[PDB]
C-alpha cells in the first residue's frame, strides 16, 4: 500500500531542491522529519510540508500506522519558466529565466 | 566448425631456471621473450597469455662482443628542462646489474597491457641463489 503527495509549480530550481531531496531517501518518517528540522536551506520547508501531507493522507484515507511508514520514493522534475528582461550597458538587453519545479513523495508500509 | 581459442581460466604454466654465465645478451633475450610470450605451444593465442615462469641467475656475468663494454650508452630524460642523463655498460653492471637484462627483454615484448602482464613472470637475480624452492623449477639450457 503506497500513498502519494505532490507540490506543483513551486518557486525554486530542481537542482537546488534535489540536494535536500537526496538526504531522506529510504529512511523512516520520524528520522526524516528530524533530519529536515535542522537543515538550514529554503527547500527543507517545502519538502517537509509535502511529507507531512503524505503522512496525513496515508493515515486518513488508507488506515495506516505512523510507526510502520517508510519513505519509498521521492523525486523532483522541471516546470515552466518565466521570461523577463534585464537592461545592460550601451543599450543592450538580456533575458532572465525564473525556474520552477514539481515535487513528489511516496510513502509505504513495505 | 570454428577455430580453437584458449581460455585464461584453464591454462598450464611451468617454472624454469636458467644460468647466464658467459652468454650473449641479445641471443639470450630472444629466447627469453619467445618463451614469455608463449610462441612454442600449439595453443598460442594472440589475445591470451600462454607463457611460463622463468628465473635467471648470475645476471652480472653476461657477455658482449667488440668494444661494447666501454661504448654502449644508455640514455634517459627526467622531465625537467635540461635533464638528459646517460650511463655506460660498465657503470650499469657495477650499480644495477639486473636492469641490463630487464631492459633488453622489455624492448622485445608487445607494447600494451598484455605485454606489461607478460613482463611480470620474469625474475632476475645478480648471484647464484633464489628463494623459490617451493615452486620446483626445472633446469633449462639455452
Amino acid at each position: 500500500m503506497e500513498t502519494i503527495a505532490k507540490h506543483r509549480h513551486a518557486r525554486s530550481s530542481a537542482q537546488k531542491v534535489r540536494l535536500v531531496a537526496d538526504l531522506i531517501r529510504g529512511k523512516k518518517v520520524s528520522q526524516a522529519l528530524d533530519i529536515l528540522t535542522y537543515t538550514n536551506k529554503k527547500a527543507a520547508v517545502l519538502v517537509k510540508k509535502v511529507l507531512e501531507s503524505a503522512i496525513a493522507n496515508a493515515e486518513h484515507n488508507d488506515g495506516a500506522d505512523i510507526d510502520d511508514l517508510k519513505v519509498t520514493k521521492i523525486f523532483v522534475d522541471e516546470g515552466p519558466s518565466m521570461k523577463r528582461i534585464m537592461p545592460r550597458a550601451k543599450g543592450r538587453a538580456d533575458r532572465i529565466l525564473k525556474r520552477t519545479s514539481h515535487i513528489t513523495v511516496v510513502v509505504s508500509d513495505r | 566448425m570454428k577455430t580453437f581459442t584458449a581460455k585464461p581460466e584453464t591454462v598450464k604454466r611451468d617454472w624454469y631456471v636458467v644460468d647466464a654465465t658467459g652468454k650473449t645478451l641479445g641471443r639470450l633475450a630472444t629466447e627469453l621473450a619467445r618463451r614469455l610470450r608463449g610462441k612454442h605451444k600449439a595453443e598460442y593465442t594472440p589475445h591470451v597469455d600462454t607463457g611460463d615462469y622463468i628465473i635467471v641467475l648470475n645476471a652480472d656475468k653476461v657477455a658482449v662482443t667488440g668494444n661494447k663494454r666501454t661504448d654502449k650508452v644508455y640514455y634517459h630524460h627526467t622531465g625537467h628542462i635540461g635533464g638528459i642523463k646517460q650511463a655506460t655498460f660498465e657503470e650499469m653492471i657495477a650499480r644495477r646489474p639486473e636492469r641490463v637484462i630487464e631492459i633488453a627483454v622489455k624492448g622485445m615484448l608487445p607494447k600494451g597491457p598484455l605485454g606489461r602482464a607478460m613482463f611480470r613472470k620474469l625474475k632476475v637475480y645478480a648471484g647464484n641463489e633464489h628463494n623459490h624452492a617451493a615452486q620446483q623449477p626445472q633446469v633449462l639450457d639455452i
Binding site: 540536494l19 535536500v20 537526496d22 538526504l23 528530524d34 535542522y38 | -
Partner: protein, 55 residues
C-alpha cells in the same frame, strides 16, 4: 576567454560529484524536559543542561 568545444554532461556530473550535503550525526536529550536539541544549544522551550534559562 571562452570555450572552443561544448562540454559534456559526463563532465558536468564529474565536477558536481563534490556538492553533496551532510546531515547531523546525532541529537542530544535534555535531562529534565526530555526534548531533542543541537549539542551545546538551548531547547525550544528554554532549557539547557537541566535548567530553565528563558521564560
Amino acid at each position: 576567454a571562452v570555450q572552443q568545444n561544448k562540454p559534456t554532461r559526463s563532465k558536468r556530473g564529474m565536477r558536481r560529484s563534490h556538492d553533496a550535503l551532510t546531515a547531523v550525526t546525532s541529537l542530544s536529550v535534555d535531562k529534565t524536559s526530555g526534548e531533542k536539541h543541537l549539542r551545546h544549544h538551548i531547547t525550544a522551550d528554554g532549557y539547557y543542561r537541566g535548567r530553565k534559562v528563558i521564560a
